Coordinates of C-alpha atoms and ligand atoms in Angstrom, one line a residue:
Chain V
X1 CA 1.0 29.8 14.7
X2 CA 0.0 28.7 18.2
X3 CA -2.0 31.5 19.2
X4 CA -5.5 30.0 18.8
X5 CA -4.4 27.1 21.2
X6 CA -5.5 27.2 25.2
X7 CA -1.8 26.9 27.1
X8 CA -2.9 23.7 28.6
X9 CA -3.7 22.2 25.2
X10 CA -0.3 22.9 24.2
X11 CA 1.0 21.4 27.4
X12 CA -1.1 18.4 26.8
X13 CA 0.0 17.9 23.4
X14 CA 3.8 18.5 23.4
X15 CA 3.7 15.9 26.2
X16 CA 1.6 13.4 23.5
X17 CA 4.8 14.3 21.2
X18 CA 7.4 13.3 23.4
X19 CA 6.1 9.7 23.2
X20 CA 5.4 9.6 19.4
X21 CA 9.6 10.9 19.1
X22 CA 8.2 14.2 17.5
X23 CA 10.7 16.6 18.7
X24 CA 10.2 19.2 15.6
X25 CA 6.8 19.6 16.9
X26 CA 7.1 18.9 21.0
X27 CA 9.2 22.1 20.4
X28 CA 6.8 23.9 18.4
X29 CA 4.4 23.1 21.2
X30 CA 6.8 24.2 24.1
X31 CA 7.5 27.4 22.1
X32 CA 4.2 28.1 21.8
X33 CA 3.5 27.3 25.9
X34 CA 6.0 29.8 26.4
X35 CA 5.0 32.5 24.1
X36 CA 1.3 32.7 26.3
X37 CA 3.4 34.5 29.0
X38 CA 3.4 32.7 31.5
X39 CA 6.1 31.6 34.1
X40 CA 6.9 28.0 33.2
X41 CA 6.9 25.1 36.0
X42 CA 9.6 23.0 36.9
X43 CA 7.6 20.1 35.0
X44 CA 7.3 22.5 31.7
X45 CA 10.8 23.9 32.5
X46 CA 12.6 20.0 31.4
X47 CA 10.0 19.7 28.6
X48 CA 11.3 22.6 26.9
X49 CA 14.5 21.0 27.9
X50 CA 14.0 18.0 26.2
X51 CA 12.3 18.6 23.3
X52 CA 14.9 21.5 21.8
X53 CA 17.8 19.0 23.4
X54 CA 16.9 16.3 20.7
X55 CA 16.0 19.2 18.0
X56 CA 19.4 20.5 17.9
X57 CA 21.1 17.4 19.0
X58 CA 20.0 15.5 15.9
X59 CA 21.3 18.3 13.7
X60 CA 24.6 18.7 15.9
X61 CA 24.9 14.9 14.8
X62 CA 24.5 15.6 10.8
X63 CA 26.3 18.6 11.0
X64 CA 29.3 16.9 12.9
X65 CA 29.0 13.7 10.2
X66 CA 29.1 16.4 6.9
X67 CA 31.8 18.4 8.8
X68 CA 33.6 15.1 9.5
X69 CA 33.7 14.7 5.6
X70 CA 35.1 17.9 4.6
X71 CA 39.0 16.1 4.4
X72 CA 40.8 18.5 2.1
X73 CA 43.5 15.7 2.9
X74 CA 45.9 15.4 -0.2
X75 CA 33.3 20.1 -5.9
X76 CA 31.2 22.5 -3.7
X77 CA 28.3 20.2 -3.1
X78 CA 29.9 18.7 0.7
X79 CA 30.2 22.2 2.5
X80 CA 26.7 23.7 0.8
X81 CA 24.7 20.8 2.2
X82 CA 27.3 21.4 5.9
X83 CA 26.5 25.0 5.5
X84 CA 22.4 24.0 5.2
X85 CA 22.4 22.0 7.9
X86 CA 25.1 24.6 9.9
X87 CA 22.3 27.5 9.1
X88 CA 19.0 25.0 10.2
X89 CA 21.3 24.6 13.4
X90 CA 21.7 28.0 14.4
X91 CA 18.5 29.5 13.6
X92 CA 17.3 26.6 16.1
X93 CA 20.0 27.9 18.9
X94 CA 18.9 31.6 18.3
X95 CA 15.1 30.4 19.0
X96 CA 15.6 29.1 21.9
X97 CA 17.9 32.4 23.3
X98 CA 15.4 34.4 22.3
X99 CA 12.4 32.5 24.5
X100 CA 15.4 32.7 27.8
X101 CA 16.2 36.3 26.9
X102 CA 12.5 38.0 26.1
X103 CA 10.5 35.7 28.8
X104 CA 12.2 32.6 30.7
X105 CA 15.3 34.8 32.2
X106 CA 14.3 37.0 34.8
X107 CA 16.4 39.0 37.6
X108 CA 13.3 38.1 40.1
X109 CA 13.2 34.2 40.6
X110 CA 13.9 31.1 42.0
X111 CA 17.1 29.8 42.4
X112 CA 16.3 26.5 40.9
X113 CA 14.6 28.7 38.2
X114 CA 16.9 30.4 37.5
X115 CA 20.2 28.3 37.1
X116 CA 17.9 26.0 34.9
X117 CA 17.7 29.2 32.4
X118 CA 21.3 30.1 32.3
X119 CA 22.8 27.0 32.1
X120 CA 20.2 26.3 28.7
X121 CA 21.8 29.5 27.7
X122 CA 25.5 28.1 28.4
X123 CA 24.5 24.9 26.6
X124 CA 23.0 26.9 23.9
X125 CA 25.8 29.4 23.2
X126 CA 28.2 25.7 23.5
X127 CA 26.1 24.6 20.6
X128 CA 26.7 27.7 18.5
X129 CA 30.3 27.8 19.4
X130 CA 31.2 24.4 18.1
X131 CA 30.0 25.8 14.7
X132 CA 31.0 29.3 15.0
X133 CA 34.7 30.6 13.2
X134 CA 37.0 33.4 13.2
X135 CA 36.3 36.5 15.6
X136 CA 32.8 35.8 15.7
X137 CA 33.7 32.4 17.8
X138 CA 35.0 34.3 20.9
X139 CA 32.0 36.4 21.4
X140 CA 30.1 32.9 21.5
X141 CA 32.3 31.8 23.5
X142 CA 32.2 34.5 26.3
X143 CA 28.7 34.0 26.4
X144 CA 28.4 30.9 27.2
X145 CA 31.1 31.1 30.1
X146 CA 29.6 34.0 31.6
X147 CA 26.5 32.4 31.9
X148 CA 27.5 28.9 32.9
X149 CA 29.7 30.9 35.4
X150 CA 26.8 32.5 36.6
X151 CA 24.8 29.6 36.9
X152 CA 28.0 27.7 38.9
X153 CA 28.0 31.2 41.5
X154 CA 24.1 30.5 42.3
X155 CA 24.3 27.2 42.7
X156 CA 27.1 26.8 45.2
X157 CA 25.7 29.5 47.1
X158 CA 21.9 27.9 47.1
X159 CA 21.8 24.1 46.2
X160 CA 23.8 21.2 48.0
X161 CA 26.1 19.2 46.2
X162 CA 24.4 16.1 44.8
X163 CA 21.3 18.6 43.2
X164 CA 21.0 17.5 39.8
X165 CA 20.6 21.0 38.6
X166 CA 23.8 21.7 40.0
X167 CA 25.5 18.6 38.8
X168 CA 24.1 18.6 35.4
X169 CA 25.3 22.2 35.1
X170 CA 28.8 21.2 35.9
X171 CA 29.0 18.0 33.9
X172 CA 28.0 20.5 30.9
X173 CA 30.3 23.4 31.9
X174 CA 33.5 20.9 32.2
X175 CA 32.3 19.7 28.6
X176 CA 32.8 23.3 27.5
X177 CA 36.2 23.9 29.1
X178 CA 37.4 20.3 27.0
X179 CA 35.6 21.1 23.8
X180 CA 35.1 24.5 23.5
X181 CA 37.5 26.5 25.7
X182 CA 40.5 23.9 25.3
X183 CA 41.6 23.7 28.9
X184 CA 41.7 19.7 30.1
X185 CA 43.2 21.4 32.9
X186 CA 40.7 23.0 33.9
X187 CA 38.0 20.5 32.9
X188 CA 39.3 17.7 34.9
X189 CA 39.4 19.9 37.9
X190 CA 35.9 20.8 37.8
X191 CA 34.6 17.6 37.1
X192 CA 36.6 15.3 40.1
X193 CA 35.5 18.3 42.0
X194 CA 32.1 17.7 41.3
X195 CA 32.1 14.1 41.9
X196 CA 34.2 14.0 45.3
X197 CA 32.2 17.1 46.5
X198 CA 29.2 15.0 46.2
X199 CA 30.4 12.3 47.7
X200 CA 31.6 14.0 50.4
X201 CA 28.1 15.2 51.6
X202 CA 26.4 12.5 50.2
X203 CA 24.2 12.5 52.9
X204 CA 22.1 15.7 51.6
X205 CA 21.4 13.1 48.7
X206 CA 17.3 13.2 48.8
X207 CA 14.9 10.2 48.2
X208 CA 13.7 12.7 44.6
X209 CA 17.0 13.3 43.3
X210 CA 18.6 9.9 43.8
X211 CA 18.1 8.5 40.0
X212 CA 18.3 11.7 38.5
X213 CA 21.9 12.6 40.4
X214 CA 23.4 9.6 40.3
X215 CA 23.4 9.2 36.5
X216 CA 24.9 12.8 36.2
X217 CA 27.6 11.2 38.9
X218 CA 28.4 8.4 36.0
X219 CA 28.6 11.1 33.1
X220 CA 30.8 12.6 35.3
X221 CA 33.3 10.0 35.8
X222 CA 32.8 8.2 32.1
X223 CA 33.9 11.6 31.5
X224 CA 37.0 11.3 33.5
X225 CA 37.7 7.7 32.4
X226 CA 37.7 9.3 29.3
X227 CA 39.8 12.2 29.9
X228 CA 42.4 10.4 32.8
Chain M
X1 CA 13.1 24.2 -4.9
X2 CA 15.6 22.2 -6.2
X3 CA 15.4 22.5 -9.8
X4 CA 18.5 24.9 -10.0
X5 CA 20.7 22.1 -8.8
X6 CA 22.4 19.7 -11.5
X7 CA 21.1 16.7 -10.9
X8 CA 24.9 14.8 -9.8
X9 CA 24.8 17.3 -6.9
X10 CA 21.4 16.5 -6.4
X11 CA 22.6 12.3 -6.3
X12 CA 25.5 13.1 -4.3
X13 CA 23.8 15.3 -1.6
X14 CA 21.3 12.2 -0.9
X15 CA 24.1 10.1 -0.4
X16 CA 25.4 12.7 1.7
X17 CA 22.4 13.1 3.5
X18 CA 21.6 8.9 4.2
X19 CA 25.4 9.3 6.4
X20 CA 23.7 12.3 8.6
X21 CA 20.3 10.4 8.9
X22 CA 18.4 13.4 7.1
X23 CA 15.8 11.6 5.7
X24 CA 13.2 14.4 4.8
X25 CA 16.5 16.1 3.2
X26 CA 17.3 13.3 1.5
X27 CA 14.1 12.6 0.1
X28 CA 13.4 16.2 -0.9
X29 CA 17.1 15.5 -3.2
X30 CA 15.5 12.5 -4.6
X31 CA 12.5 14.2 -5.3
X32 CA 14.5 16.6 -6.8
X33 CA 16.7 14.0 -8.9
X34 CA 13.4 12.4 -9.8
X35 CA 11.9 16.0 -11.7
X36 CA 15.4 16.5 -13.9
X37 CA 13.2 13.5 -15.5
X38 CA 15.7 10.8 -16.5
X39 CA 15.2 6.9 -15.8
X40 CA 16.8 6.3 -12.0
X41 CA 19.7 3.7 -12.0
X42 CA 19.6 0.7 -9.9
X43 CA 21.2 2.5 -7.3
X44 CA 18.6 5.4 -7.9
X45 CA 16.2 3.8 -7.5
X46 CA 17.3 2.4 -3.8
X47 CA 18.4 5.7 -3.1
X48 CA 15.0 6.8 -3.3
X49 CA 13.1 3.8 -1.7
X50 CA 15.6 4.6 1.3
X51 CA 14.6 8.3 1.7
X52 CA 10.6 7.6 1.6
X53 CA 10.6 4.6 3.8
X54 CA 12.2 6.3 6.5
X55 CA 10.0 9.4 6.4
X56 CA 7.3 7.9 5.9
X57 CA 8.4 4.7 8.8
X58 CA 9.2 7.3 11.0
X59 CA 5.3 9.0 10.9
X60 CA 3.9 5.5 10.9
X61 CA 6.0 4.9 14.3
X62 CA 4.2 8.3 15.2
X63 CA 0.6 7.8 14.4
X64 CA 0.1 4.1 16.0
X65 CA 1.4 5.7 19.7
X66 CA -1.0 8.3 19.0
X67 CA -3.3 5.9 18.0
X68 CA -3.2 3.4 20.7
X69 CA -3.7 6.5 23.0
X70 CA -7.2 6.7 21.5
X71 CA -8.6 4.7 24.3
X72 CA -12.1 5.3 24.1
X73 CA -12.3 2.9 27.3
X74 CA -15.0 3.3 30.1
X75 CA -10.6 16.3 25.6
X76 CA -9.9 16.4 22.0
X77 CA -6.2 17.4 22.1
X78 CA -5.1 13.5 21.2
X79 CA -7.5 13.5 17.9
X80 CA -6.1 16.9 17.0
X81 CA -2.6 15.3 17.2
X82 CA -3.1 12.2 15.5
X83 CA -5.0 13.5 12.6
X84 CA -1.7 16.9 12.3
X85 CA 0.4 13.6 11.4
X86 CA -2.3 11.3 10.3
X87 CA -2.9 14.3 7.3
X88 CA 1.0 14.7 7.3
X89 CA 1.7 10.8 6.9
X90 CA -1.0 11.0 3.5
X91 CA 0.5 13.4 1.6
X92 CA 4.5 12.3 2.0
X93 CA 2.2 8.9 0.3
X94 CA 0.3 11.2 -2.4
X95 CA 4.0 12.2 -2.8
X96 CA 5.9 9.4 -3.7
X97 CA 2.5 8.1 -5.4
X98 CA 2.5 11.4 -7.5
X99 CA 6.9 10.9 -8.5
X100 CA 5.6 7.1 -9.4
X101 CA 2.5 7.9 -11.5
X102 CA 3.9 10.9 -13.4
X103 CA 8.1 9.8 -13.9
X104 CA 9.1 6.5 -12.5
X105 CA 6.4 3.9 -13.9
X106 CA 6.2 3.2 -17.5
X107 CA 4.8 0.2 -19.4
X108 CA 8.0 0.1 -21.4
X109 CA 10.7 -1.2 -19.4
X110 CA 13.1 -3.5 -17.7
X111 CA 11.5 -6.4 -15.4
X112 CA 13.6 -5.6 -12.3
X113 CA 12.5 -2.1 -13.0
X114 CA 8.9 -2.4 -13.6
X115 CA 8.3 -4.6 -10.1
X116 CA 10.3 -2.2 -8.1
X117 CA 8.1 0.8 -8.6
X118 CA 4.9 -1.7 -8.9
X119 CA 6.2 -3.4 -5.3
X120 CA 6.6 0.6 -3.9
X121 CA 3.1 1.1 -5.5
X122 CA 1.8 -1.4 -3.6
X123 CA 3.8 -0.2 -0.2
X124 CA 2.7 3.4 -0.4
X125 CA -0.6 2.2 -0.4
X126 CA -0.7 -0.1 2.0
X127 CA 0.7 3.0 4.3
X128 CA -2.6 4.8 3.4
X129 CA -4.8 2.0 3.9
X130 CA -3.5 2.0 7.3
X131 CA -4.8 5.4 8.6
X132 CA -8.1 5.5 6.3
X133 CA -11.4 4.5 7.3
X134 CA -14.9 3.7 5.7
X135 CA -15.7 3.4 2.1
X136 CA -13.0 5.1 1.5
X137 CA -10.6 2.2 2.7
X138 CA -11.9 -0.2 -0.1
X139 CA -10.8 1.8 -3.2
X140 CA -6.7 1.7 -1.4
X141 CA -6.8 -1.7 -0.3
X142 CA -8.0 -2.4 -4.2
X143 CA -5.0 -0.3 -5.4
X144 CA -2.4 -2.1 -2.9
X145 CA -3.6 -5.1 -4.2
X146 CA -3.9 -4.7 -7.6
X147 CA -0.4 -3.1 -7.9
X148 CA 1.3 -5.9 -5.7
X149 CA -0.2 -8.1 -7.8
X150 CA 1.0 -7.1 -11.1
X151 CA 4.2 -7.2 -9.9
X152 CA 4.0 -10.7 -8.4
X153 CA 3.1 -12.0 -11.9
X154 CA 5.9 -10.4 -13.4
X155 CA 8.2 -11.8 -10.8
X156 CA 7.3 -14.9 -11.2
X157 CA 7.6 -15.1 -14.9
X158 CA 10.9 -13.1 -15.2
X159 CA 12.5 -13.5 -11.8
X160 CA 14.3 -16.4 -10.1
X161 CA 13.2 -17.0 -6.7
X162 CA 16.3 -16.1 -4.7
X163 CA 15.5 -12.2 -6.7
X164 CA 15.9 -10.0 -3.6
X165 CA 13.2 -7.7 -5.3
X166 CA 11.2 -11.3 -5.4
X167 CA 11.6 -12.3 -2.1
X168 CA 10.9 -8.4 -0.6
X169 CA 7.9 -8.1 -2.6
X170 CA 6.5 -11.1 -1.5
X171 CA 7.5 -10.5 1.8
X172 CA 5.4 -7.2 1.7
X173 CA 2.7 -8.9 0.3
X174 CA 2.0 -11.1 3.0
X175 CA 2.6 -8.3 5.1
X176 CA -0.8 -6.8 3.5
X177 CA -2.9 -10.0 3.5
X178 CA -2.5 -10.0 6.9
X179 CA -2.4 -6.6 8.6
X180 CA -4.3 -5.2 5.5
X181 CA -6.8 -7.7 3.9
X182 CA -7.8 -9.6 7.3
X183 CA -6.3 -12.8 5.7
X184 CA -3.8 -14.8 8.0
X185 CA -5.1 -17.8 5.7
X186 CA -3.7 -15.9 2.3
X187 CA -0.5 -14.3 4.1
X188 CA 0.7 -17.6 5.6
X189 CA 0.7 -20.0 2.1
X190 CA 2.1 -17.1 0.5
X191 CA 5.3 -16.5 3.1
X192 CA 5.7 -20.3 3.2
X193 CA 5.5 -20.4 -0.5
X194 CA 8.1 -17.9 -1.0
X195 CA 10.7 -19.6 1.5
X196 CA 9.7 -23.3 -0.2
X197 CA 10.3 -22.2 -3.3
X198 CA 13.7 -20.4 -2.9
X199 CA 15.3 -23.0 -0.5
X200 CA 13.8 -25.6 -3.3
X201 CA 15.9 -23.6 -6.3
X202 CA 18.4 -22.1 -4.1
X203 CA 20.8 -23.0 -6.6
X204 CA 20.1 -19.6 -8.3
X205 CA 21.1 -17.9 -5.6
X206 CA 24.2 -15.6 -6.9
X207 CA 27.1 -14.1 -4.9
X208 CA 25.1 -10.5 -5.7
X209 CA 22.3 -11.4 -4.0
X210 CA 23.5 -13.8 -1.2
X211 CA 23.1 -11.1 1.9
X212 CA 20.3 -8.9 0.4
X213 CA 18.4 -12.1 -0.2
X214 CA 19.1 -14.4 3.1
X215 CA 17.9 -11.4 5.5
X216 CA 14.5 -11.2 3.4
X217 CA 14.8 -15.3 3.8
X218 CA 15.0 -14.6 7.8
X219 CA 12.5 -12.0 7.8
X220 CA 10.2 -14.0 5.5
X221 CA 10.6 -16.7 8.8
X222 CA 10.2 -14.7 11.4
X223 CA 7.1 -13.4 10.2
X224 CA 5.6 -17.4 9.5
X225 CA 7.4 -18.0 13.8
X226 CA 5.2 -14.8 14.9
X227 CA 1.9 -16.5 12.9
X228 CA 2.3 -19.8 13.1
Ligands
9SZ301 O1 11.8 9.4 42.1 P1 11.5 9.0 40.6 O2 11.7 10.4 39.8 O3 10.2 8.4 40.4 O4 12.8 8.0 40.2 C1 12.5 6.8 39.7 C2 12.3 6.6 38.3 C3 12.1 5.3 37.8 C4 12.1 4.2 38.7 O5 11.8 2.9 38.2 P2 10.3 2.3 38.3 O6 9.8 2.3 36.8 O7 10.5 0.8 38.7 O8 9.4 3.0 39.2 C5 12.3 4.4 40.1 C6 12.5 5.7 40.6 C7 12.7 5.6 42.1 C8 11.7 4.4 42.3 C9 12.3 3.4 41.3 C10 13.7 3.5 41.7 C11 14.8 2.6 41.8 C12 16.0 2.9 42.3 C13 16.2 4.2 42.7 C14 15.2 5.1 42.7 C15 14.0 4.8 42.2 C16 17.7 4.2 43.2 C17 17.8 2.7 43.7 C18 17.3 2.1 42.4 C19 18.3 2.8 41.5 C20 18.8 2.3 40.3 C21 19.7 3.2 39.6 C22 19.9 4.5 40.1 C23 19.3 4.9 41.3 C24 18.5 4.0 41.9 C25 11.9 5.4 36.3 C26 11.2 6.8 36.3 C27 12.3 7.5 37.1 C28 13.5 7.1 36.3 C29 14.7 7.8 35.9 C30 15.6 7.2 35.1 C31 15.4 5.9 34.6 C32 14.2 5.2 35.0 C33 13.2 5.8 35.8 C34 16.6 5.5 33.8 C35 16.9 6.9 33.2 C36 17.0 7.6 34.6 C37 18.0 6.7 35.3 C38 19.0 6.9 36.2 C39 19.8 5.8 36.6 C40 19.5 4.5 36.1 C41 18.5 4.3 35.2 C42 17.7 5.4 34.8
9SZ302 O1 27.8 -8.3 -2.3 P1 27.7 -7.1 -1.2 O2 26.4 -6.2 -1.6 O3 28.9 -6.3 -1.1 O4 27.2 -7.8 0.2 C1 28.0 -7.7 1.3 C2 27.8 -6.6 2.2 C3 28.6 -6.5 3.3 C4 29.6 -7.4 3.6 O5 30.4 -7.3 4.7 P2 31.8 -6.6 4.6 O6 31.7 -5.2 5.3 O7 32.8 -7.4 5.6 O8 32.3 -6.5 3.2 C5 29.8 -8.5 2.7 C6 29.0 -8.6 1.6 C7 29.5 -9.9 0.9 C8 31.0 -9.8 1.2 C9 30.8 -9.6 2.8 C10 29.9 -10.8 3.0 C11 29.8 -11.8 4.0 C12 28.9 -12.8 3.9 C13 28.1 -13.0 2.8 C14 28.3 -12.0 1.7 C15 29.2 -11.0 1.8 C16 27.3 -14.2 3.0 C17 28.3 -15.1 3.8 C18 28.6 -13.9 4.9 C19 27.1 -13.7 5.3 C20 26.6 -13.3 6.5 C21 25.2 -13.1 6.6 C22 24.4 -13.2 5.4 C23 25.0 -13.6 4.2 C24 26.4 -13.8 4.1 C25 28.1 -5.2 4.0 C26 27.7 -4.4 2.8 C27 26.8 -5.4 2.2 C28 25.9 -5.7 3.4 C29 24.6 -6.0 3.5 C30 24.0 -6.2 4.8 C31 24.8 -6.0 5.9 C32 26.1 -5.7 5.8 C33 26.7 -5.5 4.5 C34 23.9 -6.3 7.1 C35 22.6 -5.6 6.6 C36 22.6 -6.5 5.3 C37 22.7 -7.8 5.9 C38 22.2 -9.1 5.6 C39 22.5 -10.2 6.4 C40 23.3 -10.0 7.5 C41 23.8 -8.8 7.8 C42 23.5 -7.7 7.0
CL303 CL1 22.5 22.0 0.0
CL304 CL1 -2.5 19.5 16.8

């Protein structure tokens, strides 16, 4: 599909699509970046990131709107366009697993690297779940935690505190344990203990990570308005 | 592709999809809805407009970032790009132009029919005549023109001047004098015009038309503010 392209071309153009909102095809492009076989950078990494982020999150949307109008309070054509949408969805979600399983996931990495990977392949599995029924929605389920768990194991071994790899992860991991897992309990606890951790050695807070960690810091606490 | 769907199902899914913001669904339904062959309703006919305009709006959006990024100031990965969506852009226009041609316009029928698929005659061309270039350009500017006018002189003999499908046809058509025909002269007397003309009669305004009709009233000014 992409095959014919140099990797740098590629690059090159799934950043031109990022600016012209073409998220079908900035993902096209990243697949295709990643399919040449090499080890992505940490620049590449978030526009993988971005582009399948707004791919599936556009269909999460529609899929949560048609799935929203299924009442049955009190004909077919509701759930078959749900279930087109549902399939379009998942066959997205199983694309990207694929590209972390066959070449972005290795044992041999960095640590940043690798937490990145797995916590794609929490959010991922999250995205499946929230469609997912029946005895095929543990599985998904177990998934996701073990590899968001993971993720959490790495990074409190190997980042500090206000990392926004590490806080991103656990802003997306207590959004599991609310929406998916159905623990607030354990939610809540996660997420202040994010926050005050942070703030606690707020002095490891770098000059590169200020912007990007202190927004995850306000999803954090929205969060917690929210939930408290 | 659609043509073992009833055409109801077909009506209800694009309402369905126009609440998910599927657009390129919702058009492939009306597409669909279009080729069971019947005369589209009022509502149909909207229904429709909505679908394409967004598409097509949305590819527009697309090729004028790529576009600007054509420098040419002081690699050919940006061409590549813009002409993907450029070619993409033309034939979601040979589209619509193909379901107006062949099923929609007819010389037998109703006045607020007629103008509505002469005014999105005029619009899909004017989408054209925005990516083409050289001798090619004339011939669609010809066909914008000549379609928006045929609809203007039916408008004017059969349509009050409050007509919603008045005022946004006219509206349009300044919209081509000026960023299509190189006439600010042309495209200024005609927006004035329109306003004049309904504010003069604006007793024919009706309580149907009273919100459809004062936005194209605003938009109609803010267009004459932006020029004049
Ligand atoms: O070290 P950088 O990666 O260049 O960080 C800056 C950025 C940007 C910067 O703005 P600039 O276009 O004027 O250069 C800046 C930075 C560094 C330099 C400037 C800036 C300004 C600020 C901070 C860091 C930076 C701290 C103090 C001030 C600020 C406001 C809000 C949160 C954190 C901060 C752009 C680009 C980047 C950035 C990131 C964001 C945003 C915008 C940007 C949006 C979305 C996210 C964000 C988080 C919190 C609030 C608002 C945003
Ligand atoms: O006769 P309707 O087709 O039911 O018209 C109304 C509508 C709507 C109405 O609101 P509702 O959800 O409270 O029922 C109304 C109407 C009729 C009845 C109510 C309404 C209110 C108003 C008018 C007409 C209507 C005149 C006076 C007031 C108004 C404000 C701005 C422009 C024109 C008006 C919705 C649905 C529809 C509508 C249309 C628009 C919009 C919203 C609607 C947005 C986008 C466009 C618009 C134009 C100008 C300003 C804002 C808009
Ligand atoms: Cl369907
Ligand atoms: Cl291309």
């Amino acid at each position: 599909a992409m095959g014919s392209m140099e990797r740098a071309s590629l690059i090159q153009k799934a950043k031109l699509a990022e600016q012209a909102e073409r998220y079908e095809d900035m993902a096209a492009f990243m697949k295709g970046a990643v399919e040449k076989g090499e080890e992505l950078s940490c620049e590449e990494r978030n526009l993988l990131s971005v582009a399948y982020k707004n791919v599936v999150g556009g269909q999460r949307a529609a899929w949560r709107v048609l799935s929203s109008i299924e009442q049955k309070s009190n004909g077919p054509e509701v759930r078959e366009y749900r279930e087109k949408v549902e399939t379009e969805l998942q066959g997205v979600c199983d694309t990207v697993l694929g590209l972390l399983d066959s070449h972005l996931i290795k044992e041999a990495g960095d640590a940043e690297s690798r937490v990145f990977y797995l916590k794609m392949k929490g959010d991922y599995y999250r995205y499946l779940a929230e469609v997912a029924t029946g005895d095929d929605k543990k599985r998904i389920i177990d998934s996701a935690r073990s590899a968001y768990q993971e993720a959490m194991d790495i990074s409190k071994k190997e980042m500090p505190p206000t990392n926004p790899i590490r806080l991103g992860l656990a802003l997306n991991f207590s959004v599991f344990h609310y929406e998916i897992a159905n623990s607030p309990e354990e939610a809540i606890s996660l997420a202040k203990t994010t926050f005050d951790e942070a703030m606690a050695d707020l002095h490891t807070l770098s000059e590169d990570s200020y912007k990007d960690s202190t927004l995850i810091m306000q999803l954090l606490r929205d969060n917690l308005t929210l939930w408290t």
